[PDB]
């Protein structure tokens, strides 16, 4: 019903938003008397210094912290520092049979991709027939993985293919 104040606020185009002060605050401070509605001091520096500057994007850090201790990830030659951010050089040190460490180079944390790249595979897989079967199984599983993810999905599929294709 009181659209008059609405059309008046619409009229309030000029920059001098101080006439409303003299218009309203006299009666407001008269009938309401909280001159200090917040006498608590408020002086904090918003941005002094806050940055990691000493590691990779911590997203993959928090991800890899969840994985099973049977996966041992290390650091490769420095080519995945910030943008690529991942050189998944992992060892499956556990009670199961060991194998060749995967590469699994994923992309920036935006994740418009996954990890499996398999650079050093060309000679690591075709040499051993059993490892060749392992690679075949791992490829067939990865192709059936809809939009696999950085560390969890890739490493899980790799381990399950390695310990399923034993036969």
């Amino acid at each position: 019903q009181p659209l008059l104040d609405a059309v008046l606020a619409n009229i309030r185009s000029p920059v001098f938003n101080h006439s409303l002060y003299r218009t309203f605050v006299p009666a407001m401070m008269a009938i309401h008397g909280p001159p200090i509605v917040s006498p608590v001091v408020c002086s904090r520096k918003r941005r002094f210094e806050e940055d990691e500057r000493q590691s990779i994007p911590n997203v993959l850090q928090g991800e890899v912290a969840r994985l099973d201790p049977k996966f041992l990830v290390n650091l490769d030659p420095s080519h995945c520092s910030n943008n690529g951010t991942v050189h998944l050089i992992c060892k499956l040190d556990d009670k199961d049979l060991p194998s060749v460490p995967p590469l699994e180079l994923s992309v920036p944390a935006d994740y418009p991709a996954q990890s499996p790249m398999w650079i050093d595979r060309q000679w690591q897989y075709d040499a051993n027939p059993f490892l060749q079967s392992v690679h075949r199984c791992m490829t067939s599983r990865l192709l059936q993985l809809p939009d696999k993810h950085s560390v969890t999905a890739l490493l899980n599929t790799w381990a399950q293919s390695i310990h399923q294709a034993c036969l």
């Binding site: 030659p77 420095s78 080519h79 520092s81 910030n82």
Partner: protein
């Protein structure tokens, strides 16, 4: 002097002319080569790899022979060449700590050069200075050289050689700093 000369040099855009001009520039430096090259390195090279303007400047293929001149004058400076030109004898009177082998001016000069070489190899920012130090390492192919001498006193650059692996027989040669035990160890490291 060197600042104007280099600034006017960064417009050739014709690699033949660039090589010609840089060879002549090394030529003119004589009779003052030591101090001239020292100041040139210590003043341009830090700025030449730290400012975006200097980045875009050295971003040209002509910039390839800059490090060629650098290593060419560095060895001549490290050599026991007096070059006491009486025309410049009275002028050679300075005093500078250089903001740091031995406690020798050219020594800590080359040391700061090594430090800047390592810093330009720093990750998280792949600028044209990365390609610059890449060309520099490529031009380090020489004999009786002093580039990254790797002396047993405090020579750190050898560790940065590992970062050069991110960029090979050239690695095998550059890692061969002083045939030291730790030198052999880092050579083996680079070998893999």
């Amino acid at each position: 002097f060197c600042n104007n000369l280099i600034k006017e040099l960064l417009k050739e855009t014709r690699k033949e002319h660039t090589l010609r001009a840089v060879q002549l520039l090394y030529s003119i430096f004589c009779l003052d080569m030591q101090q001239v090259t020292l100041v040139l390195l210590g003043h341009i090279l830090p700025g030449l790899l730290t400012d975006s303007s200097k980045w875009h400047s050295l971003m040209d293929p002509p910039g390839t022979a800059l490090a060629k001149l650098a290593v060419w004058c560095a060895l001549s400076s490290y050599s026991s060449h007096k070059g006491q030109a009486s025309s410049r004898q009275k002028k050679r009177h300075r005093e500078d700590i250089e903001d740091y082998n031995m406690r020798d001016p050219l020594n800590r000069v080359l040391a700061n050069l090594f430090l800047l070489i390592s810093s330009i190899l720093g990750s998280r920012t792949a600028g044209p200075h990365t390609q610059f130090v890449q060309w520099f390492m490529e031009e380090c192919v020489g004999c009786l050289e002093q580039d990254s001498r790797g002396s047993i006193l405090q020579f750190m650059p050898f560790t940065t050689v590992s970062e050069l692996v991110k960029v090979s027989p050239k690695v095998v040669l550059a890692i061969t700093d002083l045939s030291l035990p730790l030198g052999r160890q880092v050579a083996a490291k680079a070998i893999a």
